Design an enzyme around this catalytic site. Structure first.
Site, PDB file in Angstrom:
ATOM      1  N   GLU A  35      48.211  32.516  36.684  1.00  0.00           N
ATOM      2  CA  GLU A  35      46.824  32.883  36.267  1.00  0.00           C
ATOM      3  C   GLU A  35      46.312  31.858  35.264  1.00  0.00           C
ATOM      4  O   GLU A  35      45.149  31.513  35.293  1.00  0.00           O
ATOM      5  CB  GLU A  35      46.831  34.277  35.662  1.00  0.00           C
ATOM      6  CG  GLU A  35      47.091  35.375  36.685  1.00  0.00           C
ATOM      7  CD  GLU A  35      45.908  35.641  37.615  1.00  0.00           C
ATOM      8  OE1 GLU A  35      44.841  34.978  37.446  1.00  0.00           O
ATOM      9  OE2 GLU A  35      46.064  36.379  38.642  1.00  0.00           O
ATOM     10  N   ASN A  46      33.604  33.900  37.307  1.00  0.00           N
ATOM     11  CA  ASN A  46      33.565  34.409  38.706  1.00  0.00           C
ATOM     12  C   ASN A  46      32.139  34.316  39.277  1.00  0.00           C
ATOM     13  O   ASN A  46      31.172  34.269  38.514  1.00  0.00           O
ATOM     14  CB  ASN A  46      34.118  35.828  38.750  1.00  0.00           C
ATOM     15  CG  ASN A  46      35.498  35.909  38.138  1.00  0.00           C
ATOM     16  OD1 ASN A  46      36.355  35.178  38.575  1.00  0.00           O
ATOM     17  ND2 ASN A  46      35.711  36.790  37.173  1.00  0.00           N
ATOM     18  N   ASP A  48      30.387  36.586  40.616  1.00  0.00           N
ATOM     19  CA  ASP A  48      29.596  37.799  40.270  1.00  0.00           C
ATOM     20  C   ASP A  48      29.060  37.687  38.839  1.00  0.00           C
ATOM     21  O   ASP A  48      28.349  38.592  38.430  1.00  0.00           O
ATOM     22  CB  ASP A  48      30.393  39.077  40.534  1.00  0.00           C
ATOM     23  CG  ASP A  48      31.548  39.310  39.585  1.00  0.00           C
ATOM     24  OD1 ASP A  48      31.813  38.438  38.760  1.00  0.00           O
ATOM     25  OD2 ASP A  48      32.195  40.344  39.704  1.00  0.00           O
ATOM     26  N   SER A  50      30.972  37.700  36.061  1.00  0.00           N
ATOM     27  CA  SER A  50      32.050  38.130  35.169  1.00  0.00           C
ATOM     28  C   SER A  50      32.913  36.899  34.854  1.00  0.00           C
ATOM     29  O   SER A  50      32.811  35.876  35.480  1.00  0.00           O
ATOM     30  CB  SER A  50      32.859  39.248  35.781  1.00  0.00           C
ATOM     31  OG  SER A  50      33.552  38.766  36.902  1.00  0.00           O
ATOM     32  N   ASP A  52      37.049  35.825  33.552  1.00  0.00           N
ATOM     33  CA  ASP A  52      38.464  36.183  33.289  1.00  0.00           C
ATOM     34  C   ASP A  52      38.984  35.513  32.021  1.00  0.00           C
ATOM     35  O   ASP A  52      38.703  34.314  31.815  1.00  0.00           O
ATOM     36  CB  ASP A  52      39.323  35.767  34.467  1.00  0.00           C
ATOM     37  CG  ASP A  52      38.911  36.412  35.769  1.00  0.00           C
ATOM     38  OD1 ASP A  52      38.445  37.518  35.753  1.00  0.00           O
ATOM     39  OD2 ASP A  52      39.281  35.870  36.796  1.00  0.00           O
ATOM     40  N   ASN A  59      39.561  40.566  33.500  1.00  0.00           N
ATOM     41  CA  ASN A  59      38.159  40.417  33.926  1.00  0.00           C
ATOM     42  C   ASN A  59      37.197  41.280  33.092  1.00  0.00           C
ATOM     43  O   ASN A  59      37.457  42.473  32.867  1.00  0.00           O
ATOM     44  CB  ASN A  59      38.077  40.670  35.416  1.00  0.00           C
ATOM     45  CG  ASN A  59      36.713  40.338  35.943  1.00  0.00           C
ATOM     46  OD1 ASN A  59      36.372  39.180  36.191  1.00  0.00           O
ATOM     47  ND2 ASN A  59      35.879  41.334  36.013  1.00  0.00           N
TER      48      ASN A  59
END
Ligand SMILES: [Cl-]
Ligand SMILES: [Cl-]
Ligand SMILES: [Cl-]
Ligand SMILES: [Cl-]
Ligand SMILES: [Cl-]
Ligand SMILES: [Cl-]
Ligand SMILES: [Cl-]
Ligand code: NA
EC number: 3.2.1.17
Length: 129
Positions: A35, A46, A48, A50, A52, A59
């Site tokens: 990750e 992201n 959308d 959002s 991380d 998220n």
């Protein structure tokens, strides 16, 4: 902070992740490697809108507040900036909530695609734990 592999394994063991909901320590170390490359300051945006955050790429759509993810939840009740600390406590405490949420570690796409069904014990080999 960029952790070493065994340094992070020891930190995650001390915070009670070894066998948490049946996931052995190597699962958590493998998820962190893919990750974030073991970097607490990792961020990724992201499609959308959002973001991380941190070593386990948690998220902002569901788990933390960053002030710029409209209509999102804050289920860990923390600012997303807390997840970037050299102290992994906030990340670990939120990850315990995520993995209890019904999909287990499948919540982490890199775990499903790169760790699940592999010899994850390799990730803690040689470490003094
Ligand atoms: Cl490594
Ligand atoms: Cl393991
Ligand atoms: Cl927000
Ligand atoms: Cl909320
Ligand atoms: Cl908050
Ligand atoms: Cl720590
Ligand atoms: Cl599970
Ligand atoms: Na949020």
């Amino acid at each position: 902070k960029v952790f070493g592999r065994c340094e992070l394994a020891a930190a995650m063991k001390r915070h009670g992740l070894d066998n948490y909901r049946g996931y052995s320590l190597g699962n958590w170390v493998c998820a962190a490697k893919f990750e974030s490359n073991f970097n607490t300051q990792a961020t990724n945006r992201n499609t959308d809108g959002s973001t991380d955050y941190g070593i386990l790429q948690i998220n902002s759509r569901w788990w933390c507040n960053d002030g710029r993810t409209p209509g999102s939840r804050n289920l860990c009740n923390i600012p997303c900036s807390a997840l970037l600390s050299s102290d992994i406590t906030a990340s670990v405490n939120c990850a315990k909530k995520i993995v209890s949420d019904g999909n287990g570690m499948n919540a982490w796409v890199a775990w499903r695609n790169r760790c699940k069904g592999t010899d994850v014990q390799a990730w803690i080999r040689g470490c003094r734990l």
